[PDB]
């Protein structure tokens, strides 16, 4: 059996929590591969689905996004992507369209998930009502908190369903993750989820 795997590029402004996020997956971290020419770590993240293992080879930068766009080689042959921003920093959301542009310039219409990270932080700045980019671009959106594992699996499950072409694909179990470093209040989580539902009904 040839293993099913996908190159996933993880992009977004410096400081949004991309590295923290990819590192939640323990085996992905222990089996990560360094790519010296591009200054990239590729984390092989296996998920066990009802139709067998799927591997997302996640490309994480070494911080170079702080200084400009990423090189073509970073994006090349990506089959899917996650664009991350930080819900405590509005400018990171303002830069989402730039990331999307740079991405599609090299990769075109691959499946993409937009993730708003750091929702564990009480003083949230970018709320559901303001999160709109995905609605206009065909993209799926999730709130996440890398530090608490909140919604960790969501982007990967949505991408798996899209790539495989199976809307009923399920993960059999969560991968082994680093234990939460901060607690994600279940009440706040419920509220945030509801706020997104409300926002989805708004016109434009």
């Amino acid at each position: 059996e040839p293993q099913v795997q996908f190159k996933l590029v993880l992009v977004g402004d410096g400081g949004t929590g991309k590295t923290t996020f990819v590192k939640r997956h323990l085996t992905g971290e222990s089996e990560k591969k360094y790519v010296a020419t591009l200054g990239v770590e590729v984390h092989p993240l296996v998920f066990h689905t009802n139709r067998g293992p799927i591997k997302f080879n996640v490309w994480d930068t070494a911080g170079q996004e702080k200084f400009g766009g990423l090189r073509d080689g970073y994006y090349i042959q990506a089959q899917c992507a996650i664009i991350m921003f930080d819900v405590t920093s509005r400018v990171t959301y303002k830069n989402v369209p730039n990331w999307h542009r740079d991405l599609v310039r090299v990769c075109e219409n691959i499946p993409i998930v937009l993730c708003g990270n750091k929702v564990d932080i009480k003083d949230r700045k970018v709320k559901a009502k303001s999160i709109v980019f995905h609605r206009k671009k065909n993209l799926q959106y999730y709130d996440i908190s890398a530090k608490s594992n909140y919604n960790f699996e969501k982007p990967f499950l949505w991408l798996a369903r899209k790539l495989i072409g199976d809307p009923n694909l399920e993960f059999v179990a969560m991968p082994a993750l680093a234990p939460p470093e901060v607690v994600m209040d279940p009440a706040l989580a419920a509220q945030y989820e509801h706020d997104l539902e409300v926002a989805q009904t708004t016109a434009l």
Binding site: L38, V40, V42, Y74
Partner: peptide
């Protein structure tokens, strides 16, 4: 005769002598 880069895991064509992504040579 496609091959998987052992450095970055990208799949390359048989035509390619080095990885289209990371520039590593084919074994």
């Amino acid at each position: 005769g496609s091959w998987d880069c052992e450095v970055c895991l990208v799949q390359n064509k048989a035509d390619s002598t080095k990885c289209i992504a990371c520039e590593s040579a084919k074994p």
